Scaffold this motif. Sequence first.
Motif, PDB file in Angstrom:
ATOM      1  N   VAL A 116      34.872  75.500 103.048  1.00  0.00           N
ATOM      2  CA  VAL A 116      34.712  74.132 102.569  1.00  0.00           C
ATOM      3  C   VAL A 116      35.140  74.057 101.111  1.00  0.00           C
ATOM      4  N   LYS A 117      35.847  72.981 100.771  1.00  0.00           N
ATOM      5  CA  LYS A 117      36.309  72.712  99.418  1.00  0.00           C
ATOM      6  C   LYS A 117      35.928  71.287  99.043  1.00  0.00           C
ATOM      7  N   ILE A 118      35.287  71.134  97.882  1.00  0.00           N
ATOM      8  CA  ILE A 118      34.646  69.890  97.468  1.00  0.00           C
ATOM      9  C   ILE A 118      35.297  69.407  96.177  1.00  0.00           C
ATOM     10  N   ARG A 119      35.492  68.092  96.060  1.00  0.00           N
ATOM     11  CA  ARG A 119      35.919  67.498  94.790  1.00  0.00           C
ATOM     12  C   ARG A 119      35.256  66.128  94.674  1.00  0.00           C
ATOM     13  N   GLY A 120      34.237  66.039  93.827  1.00  0.00           N
ATOM     14  CA  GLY A 120      33.536  64.790  93.559  1.00  0.00           C
ATOM     15  C   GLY A 120      33.803  64.329  92.136  1.00  0.00           C
ATOM     16  N   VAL A 121      34.016  63.024  91.976  1.00  0.00           N
ATOM     17  CA  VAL A 121      34.380  62.436  90.696  1.00  0.00           C
ATOM     18  C   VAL A 121      33.610  61.137  90.492  1.00  0.00           C
ATOM     19  N   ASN A 122      33.439  60.783  89.217  1.00  0.00           N
ATOM     20  CA  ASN A 122      32.968  59.466  88.787  1.00  0.00           C
ATOM     21  C   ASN A 122      31.537  59.182  89.235  1.00  0.00           C
ATOM     22  N   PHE A 123      30.732  60.218  89.400  1.00  0.00           N
ATOM     23  CA  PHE A 123      29.314  60.003  89.652  1.00  0.00           C
ATOM     24  C   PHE A 123      28.656  59.566  88.351  1.00  0.00           C
ATOM     25  N   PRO A 124      27.978  58.420  88.314  1.00  0.00           N
ATOM     26  CA  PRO A 124      27.460  57.915  87.036  1.00  0.00           C
ATOM     27  C   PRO A 124      26.367  58.819  86.486  1.00  0.00           C
ATOM     28  N   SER A 125      26.420  59.044  85.170  1.00  0.00           N
ATOM     29  CA  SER A 125      25.526  60.011  84.540  1.00  0.00           C
ATOM     30  C   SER A 125      24.063  59.601  84.653  1.00  0.00           C
ATOM     31  N   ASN A 126      23.784  58.302  84.740  1.00  0.00           N
ATOM     32  CA  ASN A 126      22.418  57.813  84.857  1.00  0.00           C
ATOM     33  C   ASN A 126      22.053  57.428  86.284  1.00  0.00           C
ATOM     34  N   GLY A 127      22.906  57.736  87.251  1.00  0.00           N
ATOM     35  CA  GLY A 127      22.600  57.469  88.636  1.00  0.00           C
ATOM     36  C   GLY A 127      21.685  58.518  89.219  1.00  0.00           C
ATOM     37  N   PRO A 128      21.108  58.199  90.380  1.00  0.00           N
ATOM     38  CA  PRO A 128      20.138  59.126  90.986  1.00  0.00           C
ATOM     39  C   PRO A 128      20.738  60.466  91.380  1.00  0.00           C
ATOM     40  N   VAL A 129      22.043  60.525  91.654  1.00  0.00           N
ATOM     41  CA  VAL A 129      22.673  61.798  91.996  1.00  0.00           C
ATOM     42  C   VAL A 129      22.700  62.727  90.786  1.00  0.00           C
ATOM     43  N   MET A 130      23.252  62.252  89.665  1.00  0.00           N
ATOM     44  CA  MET A 130      23.328  63.087  88.472  1.00  0.00           C
ATOM     45  C   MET A 130      21.968  63.266  87.818  1.00  0.00           C
ATOM     46  N   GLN A 131      21.053  62.322  88.016  1.00  0.00           N
ATOM     47  CA  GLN A 131      19.690  62.466  87.540  1.00  0.00           C
ATOM     48  C   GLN A 131      18.824  63.196  88.543  1.00  0.00           C
ATOM     49  N   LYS A 132      19.373  63.520  89.710  1.00  0.00           N
ATOM     50  CA  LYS A 132      18.651  64.255  90.732  1.00  0.00           C
ATOM     51  C   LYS A 132      17.372  63.567  91.177  1.00  0.00           C
ATOM     52  N   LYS A 133      17.468  62.275  91.450  1.00  0.00           N
ATOM     53  CA  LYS A 133      16.336  61.466  91.874  1.00  0.00           C
ATOM     54  C   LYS A 133      16.463  61.065  93.345  1.00  0.00           C
ATOM     55  N   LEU A 135      15.982  62.091  97.682  1.00  0.00           N
ATOM     56  CA  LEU A 135      14.968  62.673  98.562  1.00  0.00           C
ATOM     57  C   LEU A 135      15.479  62.782  99.992  1.00  0.00           C
ATOM     58  N   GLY A 136      16.734  63.174 100.162  1.00  0.00           N
ATOM     59  CA  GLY A 136      17.260  63.396 101.493  1.00  0.00           C
ATOM     60  C   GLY A 136      17.839  62.148 102.131  1.00  0.00           C
ATOM     61  N   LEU A 159      20.802  57.315 101.340  1.00  0.00           N
ATOM     62  CA  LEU A 159      20.156  58.383 100.589  1.00  0.00           C
ATOM     63  C   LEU A 159      18.845  57.871 100.005  1.00  0.00           C
ATOM     64  N   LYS A 160      17.736  58.512 100.364  1.00  0.00           N
ATOM     65  CA  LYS A 160      16.447  58.076  99.844  1.00  0.00           C
ATOM     66  C   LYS A 160      16.320  58.430  98.368  1.00  0.00           C
ATOM     67  N   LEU A 161      15.681  57.543  97.615  1.00  0.00           N
ATOM     68  CA  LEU A 161      15.561  57.681  96.173  1.00  0.00           C
ATOM     69  C   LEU A 161      14.106  57.876  95.771  1.00  0.00           C
ATOM     70  N   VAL A 162      13.902  58.670  94.717  1.00  0.00           N
ATOM     71  CA  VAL A 162      12.596  58.713  94.073  1.00  0.00           C
ATOM     72  C   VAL A 162      12.257  57.301  93.629  1.00  0.00           C
ATOM     73  N   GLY A 163      11.116  56.791  94.074  1.00  0.00           N
ATOM     74  CA  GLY A 163      10.754  55.419  93.802  1.00  0.00           C
ATOM     75  C   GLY A 163      10.850  54.492  94.993  1.00  0.00           C
ATOM     76  N   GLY A 164      11.494  54.910  96.077  1.00  0.00           N
ATOM     77  CA  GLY A 164      11.348  54.233  97.355  1.00  0.00           C
ATOM     78  C   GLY A 164      12.583  53.538  97.877  1.00  0.00           C
ATOM     79  N   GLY A 165      13.641  53.414  97.082  1.00  0.00           N
ATOM     80  CA  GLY A 165      14.837  52.714  97.493  1.00  0.00           C
ATOM     81  C   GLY A 165      15.811  53.600  98.245  1.00  0.00           C
ATOM     82  N   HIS A 166      17.016  53.069  98.431  1.00  0.00           N
ATOM     83  CA  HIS A 166      18.108  53.809  99.039  1.00  0.00           C
ATOM     84  C   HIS A 166      19.376  53.589  98.228  1.00  0.00           C
ATOM     85  N   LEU A 167      20.217  54.617  98.196  1.00  0.00           N
ATOM     86  CA  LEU A 167      21.585  54.524  97.703  1.00  0.00           C
ATOM     87  C   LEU A 167      22.521  54.729  98.885  1.00  0.00           C
TER      88      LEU A 167
END
Length: 226
Positions: A116-133, A135-136, A159-167
């Motif tokens: 597997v080869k991965i290339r991810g770009v433009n993930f916002p620095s304050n988004g739940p992915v880069m902030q690791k928020k 929950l599966g 994607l479930k978020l810390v705090g109860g929402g979804h992305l």
Amino acid sequence: GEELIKENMHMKLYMEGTVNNHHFKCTSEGEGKPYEGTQTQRIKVVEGGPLPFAFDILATCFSKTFINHTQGIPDFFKQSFPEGFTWERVTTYEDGGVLTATQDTSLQDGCLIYNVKIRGVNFPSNGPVMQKKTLGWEANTETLYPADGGLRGHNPMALKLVGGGHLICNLKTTYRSKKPAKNLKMPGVYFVDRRLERIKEADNETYVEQHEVAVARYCDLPSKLG
């Protein structure tokens, strides 16, 4: 062909990639029952750990042989062996992150081997992915249909978020057999219902155990046309 895929199968995986500007590598080993559509993988981040992004965004990069192709659905993936197959995918997240992935699936001395080869770009620095928020993932349904020489898959994921929402993100995939298309029984439009669950994690998400159940079906609703 299909006979190469036994009732129990083992798998080994190598992964390398970059998210935004962070390089990393993972390995995994696991086993499952391909005809019951179940599998477990034990995963290590072996380079670039700990990741500065949520491990969740790599989850769907770690296995199409382990899909229960019920109800007489031709199995594009099990048919593909011994030659194996590849897949390519773009996942577009609602908040700007985009993760592309390419994967080679081979069969080596009775063991499934994933590259597997991965290339991810433009993930916002304050988004739940880069902030690791995160929950599966919620359960979901992929739609697959013949296209572009092989199979095309489309599926939104939540994607479930810390705090109860979804992305929300959207997956667009192309699955290609290493066997000529004319040498395959092709399926019609069909669906794969999935539940992917994080069973265990340790050491700042540098060790992760994942389990997936995946069952394919046609539309089970009544038809006025046939």
